[PDB]
Design a protein around this ligand. Structure first.
Ligand SMILES: *[C@@H]1O[C@H](CO[C@@H]2O[C@@H](C)[C@@H](O)[C@@H](O)[C@@H]2O)[C@@H](O[C@@H]2O[C@H](CO)[C@@H](O[C@@H]3O[C@H](CO[C@H]4O[C@H](CO)[C@@H](O)[C@H](O)[C@@H]4O[C@@H]4O[C@H](CO)[C@@H](O)[C@H](O)[C@H]4NC(C)=O)[C@@H](O)[C@H](O[C@H]4O[C@H](CO)[C@@H](O)[C@H](O)[C@@H]4O[C@@H]4O[C@H](CO)[C@@H](O)[C@H](O)[C@H]4NC(C)=O)[C@@H]3O)[C@H](O)[C@H]2NC(C)=O)[C@H](O)[C@H]1NC(C)=O
Lengths: 191, 34, 201
């Protein structure tokens, strides 16, 4: 099982994108797994390989942002089983981003839900985060991307907070990262 | 949010007048300087 | 050939009007020996009401045998065990008994920035429920609305689930229609049902 870099790591220059390779069906008694890595059929050697057991091996290769956006191949040979991967050149739609205030009948609770609706995007790889007055907000969950009737994706994110914070805080921000966006970054803010 | 380096990154990633060798160097400079 | 067993649909379980059914599926049956004998056991007591049929799976050129046993709502909810025996292969399914917490249901109106356009999204927020099996559907003062998509249930840090549903319509319809309703079915609600309504005006 081979895996692409996290979309946020790829789009942000301040982050380190990693292609991951995981080996299934491995015993605890013979754990020596030799894993090689190739970038466009050229062997690289900077891969981090740690072990785990249920046994599976997670080999992590660090990659250049541009080399994934340019769609180079990334194969990991295992001994031999070989899995490659790259970025699909597909349709690209940028996301529409809306913030929905809490439902009125929730404003008499202890907690309120701030909802971010991000829709109409292609491909389905997206990153949604929350801030308030520039500080990181950690108390949130998001749905998986869902395919919409028109062939695009939408996602909801719910930032959960004490009602005190909702009433006393100046602003909250939905921060979206997607390849359809200029600079791969957009910030929507509500007061 | 460091909008500057991200925007330099983005602009350099799509700059047509740069070859793959010069692209990687510019990106690495931006990436390392910030 | 392998065998799989599937729980009934939650909407079939909660609605008395609908018949829930357990389903036993035998995949990768051979064309040479299509003889698959499948028997059903409710609490080790054999039942004889299941309808069996064979399916050609054009995806990969294989054959599939699927057995569907119609069950009664009470037996499933009381945690009775259901077992299909295929010849021998045995598979058992029973309702997972655990925490039961009713969902709270909210309808978020379209975002203001979307009212300038010609389509709008209506949002149903469903939070704090256990277990994660739930049914969300939309109506227009009773009439079925179909242009909507749900999300999968998501595990909150609370330990409960939340789910969203998006109903799409034209802005004109959103102004002309009297009201819309998010209808939720869950085992934690009174009568397994709850209806939230919103109106534009
Ligand atoms: C030829 O093709 C067929 C068809 O392929 C399928 O259809 C095509 C069109 C493509 O989309 C394929 O991608 C797709 O898979 C192949 O037949 C498939 O074979 C696989 C096995 O390799 C079966 O996988 C199992 O799937 C169940 C879940 O099954 C649902 O979801 C499937 C989509 O993933 C879907 O195909 C199924 O039809 C089924 O869908 C549900 O169906 C019911 C009844 O009709 C319906 O009411 C529902 O609404 C509907 N829901 C949805 C969402 O569609 C999964 O649970 C299985 O996992 C168990 O078994 C694994 C071992 O195989 C094991 O590793 C797992 O851990 C897990 O083990 C279970 O664990 C639990 C608790 O942990 C335990 O209680 C269980 O006892 C235990 N079970 C076992 C056996 O240990 C598994 O992943 C597909 O169901 C099957 N598809 C069909 C249609 O039959 C076929 O393999 C191909 N042939 C060749 C040679 O390639």
């Amino acid at each position: 099982f081979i895996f692409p870099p996290n979309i946020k790591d790829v789009l942000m220059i301040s982050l380190t994108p990693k292609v991951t390779c995981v080996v299934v069906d491995v015993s605890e008694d013979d754990p020596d797994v030799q894993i090689s890595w190739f970038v466009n059929n050229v062997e690289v050697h900077t891969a981090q390989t740690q072990t785990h057991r249920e046994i599976r091996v997670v080999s992590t290769l660090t990659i250049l942002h541009q080399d994934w956006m340019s769609g180079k191949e990334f194969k990991c040979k295992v001994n031999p089983i070989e899995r490659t991967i790259s970025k699909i050149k597909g349709l690209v739609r940028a996301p529409q981003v809306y913030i929905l205030p809490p439902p009125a009948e929730q404003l008499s609770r202890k907690d309120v839900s701030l909802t971010c609706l991000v829709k109409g995007f292609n491909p389905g790889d997206i990153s949604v985060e929350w801030t308030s007055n520039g500080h990181t907000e950690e108390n949130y969950k998001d749905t998986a991307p869902v395919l919409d009737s028109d062939g695009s994706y939408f996602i909801y994110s719910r930032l959960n907070m004490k009602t005190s914070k909702w009433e006393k805080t100046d602003s909250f921000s939905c921060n979206v990262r997607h390849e359809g966006l200029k600079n791969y970054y957009l910030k929507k803010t509500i007061s | 949010f460091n909008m500057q380096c991200q925007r330099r990154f983005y602009e350099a990633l799509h700059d047509p007048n740069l070859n793959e060798e010069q692209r990687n160097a510019k990106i690495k400079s931006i990436r390392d300087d910030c």
